[model samples]
Structure formats: C-alpha cells, structure tokens
Target: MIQNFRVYYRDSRNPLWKGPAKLLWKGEGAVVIQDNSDIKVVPRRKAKIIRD
Candidate 1:
C-alpha cells in the first residue's frame, strides 16, 4: 500500500510568487494536512511502475 503525503507552502504576499515548499508523506500515499480546515480530493488513474 502507498503511504499518504501532502505539499505545503509558506505564506507569501507577492503576486507572482513562487513558494518555498515541503512534501510531507505519511506511511508510503496518504496525506494529512494540519492547520487546514477545507480539503479537496481529486482522483486519477493509477500508473504502473516499471524499471528503466
């Protein structure tokens, strides 16, 4: 099973801002967001893993 993960960015005021961010993963594809009240979930087709 894949573990959960989440991407978070620091607060900024610039209009064309690129944020400094972090990816937090729990377990192997699960994401737990702290300090966020609303959450949106989007689903997609799973991709096969292959060796190069």
Candidate 2:
C-alpha cells in the first residue's frame, strides 16, 4: 500500500524540516495530516514500495 505517513523530528538541521517541537498533532500542517505530524510533503516521483 502507498500509505502517506509523517516523517518528523524535534530538531532538524535543515529549515525545510523546521517546525514546532510539540506533539505530532499540534504541528503547523496538522489539518492535512490530521493525526499525523509531518510537515514535508512527499513527491510522486520519489517514493518506496513500502514493503518488500
């Protein structure tokens, strides 16, 4: 399955990974992610098969 999931952290070196250090639910992009807390959106051209 091509499941969309969040890849977040408290402190990321790059600004692209910068966001609130709170729980995954209270992040900036909380809505689209709903319960998830990843700020960066993945690309259609870049993805894994999930399970091999």
Candidate 3:
C-alpha cells in the first residue's frame, strides 16, 4: 500500500518570508508497517521524511 509521510522544508530569504517550515506529502493517508519490503517512493521538493 502506498502511504504518505509529513516532512519539513526550510529556506533562507526575506526575514518575513522566513519560509516557515511546512508539512508536505502525497497520498490519501499514511500508515506504518513493520516490514517495508515492497514500496515505491518519490523524492520531496525541499523536505525530509520524518520517522518516529
């Protein structure tokens, strides 16, 4: 099953445009599986996948 994960992004520019970190993901929802045996993935534009 394809799942979604939230990530944060940061940018350096205008102070006001601190480019506040944001959550980004693609999918209807997310889930955690013990075994990540079969999964396809894509790269985020400017964020990192968060795992807990």
| RMSD for each of the candidates | 10.1, 9.4, 12.0
Q: What TM-score fits each model?
A: 0.19, 0.20, 0.27
Residue-wise lDDT of candidate 2 within 9-48, one digit each (tens)? 3223443432322222222333222223533332222321
Model 3 lDDT tens row, 6-37: 44443345223112222333544442222134
Cα-based lDDT for every prediction: 0.28, 0.30, 0.35
Candidate 1 at residue 39, lDDT?
Answer: 44
The TM-score of predicted model 1 comes to 0.19
lDDT (10s digit) by residue, model 1, range 1-52: 3333334332235334122122222333343333345442211111112122
- Which of the numbered candidates is closest to the native, going by highest TM-score? 3
**Model 2 Cα displacement at 7 (Å)?**
9.2
Model 3: residues with Cα > 4 Å off, grouped in runs = 1-6, 12-24, 27-43
